[PDB]
Write a protein that binds this ligand. Sequence first.
Ligand SMILES: CS(=O)(=O)c1ccc(-c2ccc3cc(O)ccc3c2Oc2ccc(OCCN3CCCCC3)cc2)cc1
Ligand SMILES: CS(=O)(=O)c1ccc(-c2ccc3cc(O)ccc3c2Oc2ccc(OCCN3CCCCC3)cc2)cc1
Lengths: 246, 246
Amino acid sequence: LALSLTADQMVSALLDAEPPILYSEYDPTRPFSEASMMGLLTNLADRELVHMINWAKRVPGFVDLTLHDQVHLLESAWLEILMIGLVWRSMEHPGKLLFAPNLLLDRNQGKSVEGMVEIFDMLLATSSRFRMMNLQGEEFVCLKSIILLNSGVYTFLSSTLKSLEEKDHIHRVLDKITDTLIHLMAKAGLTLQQQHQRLAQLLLILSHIRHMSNKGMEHLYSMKSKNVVPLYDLLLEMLDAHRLHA
Amino acid sequence: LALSLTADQMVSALLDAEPPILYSEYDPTRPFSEASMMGLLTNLADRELVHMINWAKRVPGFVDLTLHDQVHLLESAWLEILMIGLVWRSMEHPGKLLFAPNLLLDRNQGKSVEGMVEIFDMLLATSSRFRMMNLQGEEFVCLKSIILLNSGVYTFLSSTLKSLEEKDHIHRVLDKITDTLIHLMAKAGLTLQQQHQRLAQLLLILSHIRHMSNKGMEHLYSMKSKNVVPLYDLLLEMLDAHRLHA
Ligand SMILES: CS(=O)(=O)c1ccc(-c2ccc3cc(O)ccc3c2Oc2ccc(OCCN3CCCCC3)cc2)cc1
Ligand SMILES: CS(=O)(=O)c1ccc(-c2ccc3cc(O)ccc3c2Oc2ccc(OCCN3CCCCC3)cc2)cc1
């Protein structure tokens, strides 16, 4: 059970669950100004989503939830999760965003699309903040898991017995991850005061990531009019897998 | 200086700075269905803003910032601050939002305006969460101050020496407030583990408040087309006061 795991077990579980870093899909031997910037990012995001679902399934406690609740959590968090991942891998590239190892973009390369330069600036600022705090890999995987579990937990539709039990489980797992973050900081030499200060600093950054996701979704919604399968149904199909391959 | 204050001094400073509870402005002796719901809330919000500025000025550390930075912080946080205040005074009114003592509204009374019922539901859910956590007045005033200082701090435009010093000051004050929250929880009997768990639970709610503010601003922006003085300039005029009354 997830609630039985120790701090070091939680960390190992999260580190092991980490998804791969994907590459942008474009011909390296052709003029760049030819390729659609938003086309490249959309394709990347869509491929990453598949791996995000595998990752979520390996976050302790996640698969203990109902399918419906798992979908709701990912539907609310997916863009924040993409964004915190980007910021993490951009940390050692000041002034640039490492969307993919073969797609490193600077501020001015977002002007091709509306609202993009503003979001790029916010993402760059978050990466600067992490660099400045010297964020560690173990801390990063805790934060990404907190995002998955927290972002949609205040927007649950139901209030049935089952929903109450679901929320309680989510909050117990979140408490576990808080314990894990504190543990990592204790093992890195920080005093108690430094521990709760750093915890608060990290969790306050999650509000900015929420803000970035909201602003991004504003523009994506003006932009995404494919009139096709709703994200919920797409997430469900991917999450609701058989065990005929297991 | 704010950075010199003790936990109990911080708490007393914040409690003393608390703004008044205002009343909705409408004739109690006339048909309700006559009054504009959005008209009543807008008028209330506009009057509260004036008192919010006095409050901000009394938050330790705030007036140490440049006028420009003070404005930026309030411009980014004002709706979150209105919302957390509402949720706080609605805490003991399950199912209802106490916008004012003479304006207690339930879910169904938001349907008059677009997007409103959704925001009402999110606000009600936040109030339920606070009730459920048994949020205390001392904790509430810390959270509202954290919102003021944090919401706009990742969106500072400049990177001058002065801006670096401003950000450092804001983060030191935020650390002070974290210490104060932990102190209050220590003095309420919570164990160390319970302390960092409750701190994280409270700060994660701030992400939902950010989300609510974003969604609210989406609809207010479709709705506010007064073509008049920009909020920044209005905030500046109110913040940039002479000391001819002091
Ligand atoms: C216009 S904007 O300026 O506001 C804007 C806002 C955010 C991003 C952004 C940010 C961080 C990313 C991190 C990554 O690791 C990979 C791609 C990232 C990314 O590109 C997209 C593109 C399309 C999309 O959604 C559309 C495709 N698809 C919809 C269904 C769910 C999966 C995504 C979602 C993200 C870009 C632009
Ligand atoms: C359409 S919506 O469903 O999304 C929507 C979204 C949020 C609110 C909301 C929420 C919490 C409030 C707490 C309070 O204590 C008092 C009023 C509150 C309130 O009403 C307004 C009305 C107008 C406004 O801004 C316009 C007026 N003015 C602009 C300049 C700054 C000050 C506010 C700002 C808040 C209502 C409706």
